Structure formats: C-alpha cells, structure tokens
Amino acid sequence: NQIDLNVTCRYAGVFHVEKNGRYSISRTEAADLCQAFNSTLPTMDQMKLALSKGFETCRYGFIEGNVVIPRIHPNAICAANHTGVYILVTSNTSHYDTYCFNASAPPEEDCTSVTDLPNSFDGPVTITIVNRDGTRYSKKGEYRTHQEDI
Ligand SMILES: COC(=O)CCN1CCc2ccccc2C1
C-alpha cells in the first residue's frame, strides 16, 4: 500500500509530478494530488511563465484544461521536436502525469528538495516523495477523493 511521487524543481511555482514511475494519473486524481501539495493545476499562462524561467520535461501531464509538455530545447523524442508549451491534440487514453502550481514557491527556479505533502489526509497509504537528487520523504496518508481512482 505504497505510492511513489517523483517531483521536479519548481519554476515560477510550477512542477511536474509522476506517480509510480509511469503514466498513471487521471484528471480527477491529478487535481487531488495537486491539492495535497497545497497546489492547483496550472493555467496555461502559469505554465508559459514557468517555461520562460527554464521549465521543460519530456512527459505529458495535466494542466487546467489540457495535457501538455513544456519544451525549451528541440528534441525529436520529446513532443516531436516542438518548443513551447506543446499541447497534446489526439490521444485515445486518459492517464498522464500532472503539473501542479504552488503560489508560495520562489518566483524563478527552485531546485531545492520537496520534503512535505502538507495537505495529505489521514489514510493507510505510505506516500513517498522522491526528489531528482534521490532525497525522500515519506508519510502515511491518502489524497484521492474519488472512489474510481482507488
Ligand atoms: C522532468 O520530468 C521528466 O521529463 C521526467 C524525469 N523524471 C525522471 C525520474 C524522476 C525521479 C525523481 C524525481 C524526478 C524525476 C524526473
């Protein structure tokens, strides 16, 4: 009864979260996950500012209203060599990573570790935050509010 959450640096408060090392988050779970980090799904404008501060990934994830990949450098295997906030247009499937936005983060790049899931609720799951440098923080709790996600 364990969930690993891989988290990135924040860029203008925006970060990427991947659950259990694979595309595995529904739209509803993504909102609940961001809420657990006292965050929200980013708007497109928030994501564009994050991009301008250095944010890029090679993974699809939810924002408010779309699934996107922020890209700074063109790479053939990431968003088909596009740059900018690449919007996923056509897909059969519903599960991705998520982006989240924390307004209380620093204004530019913050590559410090994340060491709390401050708004998790009581529950039986061992939830582990994993930072890119390997630092880990674990707590027992839950964050999913929709049964179809459990
Ligand atoms: C930046 O997001 C990506 O393109 C996927 C990279 N993942 C790769 C795995 C990983 C593990 C822990 C914390 C962060 C990350 C970042």
Side-chain angles (χ1 to χ4, degrees):
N1 212 357
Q2 222 276 308
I3 295 175
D4 271 351
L5 301 171
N6 295 336
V7 306
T8 64
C9 297
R10 276 67 64 213
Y11 290 86
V14 179
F15 57 109
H16 166 252
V17 182
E18 170 197 34
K19 182 181 172 191
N20 289 331
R22 55 191 181 251
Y23 287 125
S24 64
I25 306 174
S26 67
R27 179 53 180 69
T28 52
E29 183 163 347
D32 284 349
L33 190 50
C34 295
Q35 181 167 137
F37 284 106
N38 280 322
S39 296
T40 50
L41 283 294
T43 62
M44 178 62 74
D45 277 355
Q46 289 166 340
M47 176 62 72
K48 280 176 179 180
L49 192 68
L51 174 82
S52 81
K53 306 299 185 178
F55 189 39
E56 64 167 357
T57 77
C58 193
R59 298 281 288 177
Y60 292 113
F62 296 108
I63 63 170
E64 192 59 53
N66 287 99
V67 170
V68 306
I69 307 189
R71 293 306 299 166
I72 293 173
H73 307 98
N75 183 317
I77 65 159
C78 303
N81 220 54
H82 286 91
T83 67
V85 180
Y86 176 78
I87 299 172
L88 178 60
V89 173
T90 300
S91 174
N92 282 345
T93 57
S94 64
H95 280 46
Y96 298 98
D97 297 345
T98 198
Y99 300 96
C100 295
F101 166 68
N102 172 24
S104 299
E108 306 191 290
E109 179 183 65
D110 178 13
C111 284
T112 59
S113 278
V114 177
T115 39
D116 191 26
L117 188 65
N119 200 42
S120 66
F121 48 85
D122 179 80
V125 187
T126 297
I127 302 161
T128 303
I129 307 313
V130 187
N131 292 280
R132 183 62 289 189
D133 68 3
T135 309
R136 286 175 162 75
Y137 166 82
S138 303
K139 68 192 296 189
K140 203 184 47 71
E142 177 57 85
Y143 63 85
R144 297 160 297 175
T145 70
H146 297 85
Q147 193 56 46
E148 64 266 44
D149 294 322
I150 310 164

